[PDB]
Write a protein that binds this DNA or RNA. Structure first.
Lengths: 124, 130, 51, 94, 50
RNA sequence: CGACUCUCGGCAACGGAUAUCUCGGCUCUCGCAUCGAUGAAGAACGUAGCGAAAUGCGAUACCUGGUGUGAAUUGCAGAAUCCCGUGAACCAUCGAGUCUUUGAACGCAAGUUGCGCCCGAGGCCAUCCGGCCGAGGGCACGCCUGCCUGGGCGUCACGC
RNA sequence: GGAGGGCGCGGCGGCCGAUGCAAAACCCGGGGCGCGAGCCCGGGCGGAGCGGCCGUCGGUGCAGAUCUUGGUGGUAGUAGCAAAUAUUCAAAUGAGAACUUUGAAGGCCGAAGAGGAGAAAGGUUCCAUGUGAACGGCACUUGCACAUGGGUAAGCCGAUCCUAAGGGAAGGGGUAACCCCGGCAGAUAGCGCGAUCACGCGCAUCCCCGAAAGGGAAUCGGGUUAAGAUUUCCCGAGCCGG
RNA sequence: UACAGGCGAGAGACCGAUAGCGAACAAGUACCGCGAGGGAAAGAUGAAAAGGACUUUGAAAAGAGAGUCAAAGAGUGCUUG
RNA sequence: GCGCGACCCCAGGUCAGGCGGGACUACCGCUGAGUUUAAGCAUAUAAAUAAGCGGAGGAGAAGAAACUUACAAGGAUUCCC
């Protein structure tokens, strides 16, 4: 085109089925603007940058949709090779999350274990 | 130098930030002194401008020109106003950059988000004064 | 035989040939000001390109 | 004939060739090793006697680093906010 | 193989050969020999080429 | 007797010192914790309308979603809906993304865009409900845990 | 060589002065002061900050160092630009032609070539078009220069495939480790073939790289552009593998 | 208790373009070397390009007029020189 | 044979997951010079330092006495005086 096409919130308000048809058209349209790149047309000028952004938008949103459905299926069970990646950011933080301190003092010396001042006094 | 544990204070740093101006930096440095009529309406001495404003040269040699702000330039922090010009040798007329401090705001486009700036700063000036 | 065919060298030759192009006039205005006299344009007869 | 002139003139053998890993002509072909990073090699070649100039080359400057930096900065891994939607929301504060 | 399929999809023509050239650009130039049954000249007009 | 040889001044040319500048360096001090096979550090080669470079990015390619700000970007061109606005901007934020080819680099090698193997679906037609072809992504070392077919008078019972 | 008393510069605490109506800086066969270190003042140049005085402090004063770094002489318009058998005439073009380009002429290498191509190497240098700022130690309108464009298409040629000398994962073992020999309980640990049917049968020194020269699955002819053409293209004819 | 890296800050009787880091500028860049490695030179027109139209000479580069500028004794050899 | 459990020892491109490299300023280990100094030089000095190698974190190491002492006994570990 000569104008930019569309806005990201519009694509959010469209179905997954709708946007994949749009994606096909954007790729076809891009090839036209690539031959016009040589021409140096005023039509392709703005447009050839912006069409790549349009392609990017539809691809991002569809992927996000798939992850959401997957998570709802997975949360009941024991799960995630995919969502596990996001949760951690792995190795150093992974070693630090057993939860050590609470577990050690879960058994042996816990009935009287701390300073009073209040708490033991309030609750008797 | 003068007091306080804070982020910002360094003669070099002050220069560094304002020359290359990120967007928030641009808008606060785009604050141009109001004319006296406008000062008593919005109860502030200075506000960030626009492009559909009209702005009058007070300070310079070029004094007495008025025009709308055609463009604002980030990279070297300058603003460009209509009819403040110098003539090239061939007879072409090219705008001469003016600092927003030098120029004084004749007329405002209120907008909606720019309008919000007026309200918050006005509230600010009310609190100290009374 | 070919004239060393290996892709790793071949890609570098393509890249350096593209790189050895003059600075394009316009950009000297859109840098503010500072003499953009490239430097990474080399000529084959003098020096030698390392891989 | 002898030295210099005859030393230069032959040169039809190759030893140090392009390394894939570091992009430097330093790959010793007939002993299949790079002398600038190690090409087959479990560890990258690091020397702490090889001083100022060389160390900085291996420190790099074609680096990413920024992508890595953002997780350090937040420390969390979430956030949530979708304000600025027709209503006029909560998208202009104070 | 892939390019012959792609040409068939997008311009509805049979391709008889594809020929591959490295360029100093760092991308690949393709000379694609087309069918005589639908002539390259009248393929050309709708994706114009000089 | 010019001239020559020499010298100086005045004006210059030469040259880039000096002065005055400095979005930089330098050194000290303070706060902060936070990389990776979930594909790193580092490289390569591409992508901007017009770019050699730097910077940015990766076939979703000087960028995307979302969000903040609220109108610029500019060398020129350009879009005019994106301008009283779910929204301008080499913008900031950037939670949701793609993230090429490589690289610890993992199918196996690599002076090879080298050579295998496996699986996916769509279409075909039934020399079979199979054959053929398609696009994508896997298949390493290491060892735990659980697992199967078992080696073996390893040990016991029970065999004919 | 010691001690003594001073001068000049940079910055800092104090104090006082000076300025776009012309600061600092710089120039000055211009004046004057001090024994000197230095200072003072004028005129010219210049265009934004600076100096004096009292304390404080140094990366604090230069002529050298076969000094370091930058500039510039005399040398010197001097040695030279002398190997390779050698040029010349007319025309074209252009502002300008011993050298460009075309003809004519004279020659030269003398087919182990000063040749037509490939290797290796370089990397676009090839060719067109533009064209003389730098560069071709003369010249120059010419260039292997600079600018702007284009160009390398393969079932059959090579690489690939394959082994060699040899290299190197895997095992065991030293060596913290890097790293090095190199295979082991792949030997009643599984790779290979029937085989579609799930089951049986058979076997090691493995397995890859290693000559773009060894060894080798398979093409010829004509035409074409700037060019190598079995090779690009095309006709006609094949040939090999699936 | 440590801290010449990294990230984000505050300062100094710090340095002032042959100084300061190798690098104020495209710098670990250009370039050098077979490699290990070695490694520069290079900041300043002006308030604003107002970067000298036009006329004239010259093959052109340039010059001379003029225009512009507070100043060309500021013309991208650019402040002082 | 077949040995229910299992005993002992192998094999999965095996089920869910985990390791290498970096950083290496600072730190924790390992391993380890010589120039130099002694106006020579070996013992010694430099130095239980530089080089070499591995591994973590924001701190790390250390850590509640088979201690120090010789006292009306002190009392994990670290750092400063």
């Amino acid at each position: 085109m000569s104008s930019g096409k569309v806005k990201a919130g519009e694509l959010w308000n469209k179905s997954k089925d709708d946007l994949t048809k749009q994606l096909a058209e954007l790729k076809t349209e891009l090839g036209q603007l690539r031959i016009q790149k040589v021409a140096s047309s005023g039509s392709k000028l703005n447009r050839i940058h912006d069409i790549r952004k349009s392609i990017a938008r539809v691809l991002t949103v569809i992927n996000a949709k798939q992850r959401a459905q997957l998570r709802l299926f997975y949360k009941n069970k024991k799960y995630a090779p995919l969502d596990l990646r996001a949760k951690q950011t792995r190795a150093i933080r992974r070693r630090l999350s057993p939860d050590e301190k609470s577990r050690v003092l879960e058994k042996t010396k816990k009935r009287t274990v701390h300073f009073p001042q209040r708490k033991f006094a309030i609750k008797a | 130098m003068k007091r306080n544990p804070r982020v910002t204070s360094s003669r070099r740093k002050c220069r560094k930030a304002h020359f290359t101006a990120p967007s928030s930096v641009r808008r606060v440095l785009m604050s141009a002194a109001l004319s006296t009529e406008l000062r008593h309406k919005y109860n502030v001495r200075s506000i960030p401008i626009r492009k559909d404003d009209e702005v009058q040269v007070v300070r310079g040699s070029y004094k007495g020109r008025e025009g709308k702000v055609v463009q604002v330039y980030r990279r070297r922090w300058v603003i460009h106003v209509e009819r403040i010009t110098r003539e090239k040798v061939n007879g072409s007329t090219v705008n001469v950059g003016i600092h927003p401090s030098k120029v004084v705001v004749t007329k405002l486009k209120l907008d909606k988000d720019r309008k919000a700036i007026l309200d918050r700063k006005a509230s600010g000036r009310a609190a100290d004064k009374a | 035989m070919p004239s060393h065919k290996t892709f790793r060298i071949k890609q570098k030759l393509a890249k350096k040939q593209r790189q050895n192009r003059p600075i394009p006039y316009w950009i000297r205005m859109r840098t503010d000001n500072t003499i953009r006299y490239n430097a990474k344009r080399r000529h084959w007869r003098r020096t030698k390109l390392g891989f | 004939m002898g030295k210099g002139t005859g030393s230069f003139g032959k040169r039809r053998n190759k030893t140090h060739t392009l390394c894939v890993r570091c992009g430097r002509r330093s790959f010793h072909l007939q002993k299949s090793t790079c002398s600038s990073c190690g090409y087959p090699a479990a560890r990258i070649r690091k020397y702490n006697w090889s001083v100022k100039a060389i160390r900085r080359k291996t420190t790099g400057t074609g680096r990413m680093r920024y992508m890595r930096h953002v997780p350090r900065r937040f420390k969390s891994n979430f956030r949530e906010g979708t304000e600025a939607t027709p209503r006029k929301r909560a998208a202009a504060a104070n | 193989k892939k390019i012959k399929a792609a040409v068939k999809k997008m311009y509805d023509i049979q391709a008889k050969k594809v020929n591959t050239l490295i360029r100093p650009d760092g991308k690949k130039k393709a000379y694609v020999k087309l069918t005589p049954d639908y002539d390259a000249l009248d393929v050309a007009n709708k994706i114009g080429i000089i």
